[PDB]
Amino acid sequence: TPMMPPVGVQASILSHDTIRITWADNSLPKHQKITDSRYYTVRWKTNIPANTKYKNANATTLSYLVTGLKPNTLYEFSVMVTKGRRSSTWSMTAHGATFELVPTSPPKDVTVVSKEGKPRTIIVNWQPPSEANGKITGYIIYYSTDVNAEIHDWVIEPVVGNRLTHQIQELTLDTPYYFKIQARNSKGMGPMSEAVQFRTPGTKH
Ligand SMILES: *[C@@H]1O[C@H](CO)[C@@H](O)[C@H](O)[C@H]1NC(C)=O
């Protein structure tokens, strides 16, 4: 015999990894006291891609704390009830997106190449960090001719927005230069890459 599904399903954003789901049961008095053997099952998946697998959990309460979620990620949530051999279809879909977190991984695959026929110019390329934890609002490139120099003495080259390439001109020939890159998002700065070395070309004559 079929059960009516949960109603008024809501998401509460607690952190970058936790969302609280709460709902009502119209087969319970206004006060919502669970006196029965009934148990709710909560399922969730990331909104995109469409074909992702639902993760799920059981609760004896009219709320559930969903954990282990990615920062800055939008999720879909539905609930269902089971009172003994009786069960119900999945409730209305509730949506929630976890907060951003500062990046916790440095920019990946940092490379340097000399610009075509312009030896005093270089092109720097990189990849976004694995743990970006938010919409990347830019990067900061640091360069020095002394790898042992303190970060304050390193030349700051900002990169506005999610750009993965940046050209640096007016460099000195036949010289090792060192490069560190760090990512930024709305919540702050993340770790820096390990310095990559590039020696600018020499002239022939
Ligand atoms: C919820 O409980 C049912 C019955 O005990 C079980 O089949 C299901 O796997 C449970 N869900 C999880 C995530 O353990």
Same domain, 175 and 96: no
Paired residues of 87 in beta bridges:
82
In terms of domains, do 82 and 179 share one? Answer: no
- Show Cβ contacts of residue 2 under 8 Å, excluding neighbours closer than 6 positions: 86, 87, 88
Range of 57's domain? 1-102
Interior CA angle at 181 toward 178 and 183, to 5°? Answer: 175
Is the CB of 56 within 6 Å of ligand 1? Answer: yes
* Tokens of residue 65, six digits: 């704390």
Residue (of 136, 139, 18) closest to 73 by Cα position? 18
Q: How was this structure determined?
A: X-ray
Which DSSP letter does residue 33 get? -
d(CA 167, CA 182): 16
Provide the domain count of the chain. Answer: 2
Q: Which resolution in angstroms does this entry have?
A: 2.9
Q: Is the CB of 66 under 6 A from ligand 1?
A: no
Instruction: Say whether both 193 and 121 belong to one domain.
Output: yes
Q: Whose CA is nearest to atom 9 of ligand 1?
A: 57
Cα separation, 93 vs 86, in Å, equals: 22
Tell me which residue has tokens 């750009």: 163
For residue 35, which of 1, 83, 87, 85 has the smallest C-alpha distance?
83
Q: Which of 102, 135, 170 is the last residue of a domain?
A: 102
Q: Alpha-carbon distance 106 to 125, whole Å?
A: 14
Residue 142 and residue 167: Cα distance in Å, rounded? 13
Atom 2 in ligand 1: residue holding the nearest Cα: 58
Cβ of 40 below 6 Å from ligand 1 = no
Q: Are 14 and 20 in contact (CB under 8 A)?
A: yes
Q: In whole angstroms, how far apart are CA 66 and each of 5, 45, 80, 94?
A: 20, 11, 15, 13
**CATH code at 195?**
2.60.40.10
Could you identify the atom of ligand 1 that is nearest to the CA of residue 58? Answer: 1
Whose alpha carbon is nearest atom 14 of ligand 1?
Answer: 57
Q: Does the Cβ of 57 fall within 6 Å of ligand 1?
A: yes
Mark 5-31 as b/e (b = at least 16 C-beta within 10 Å): bbeebebeebebbbbebbbbbeeeeee
Q: Is residue 140 within 8 Å of 129, Cβ to Cβ?
A: no
Dist. CA 179–CA 106, nearest whole Å? 13
One domain, residues 170 and 148: yes
Together in a domain, 109 and 96 = no
Residues 204, 107 within the same domain: yes
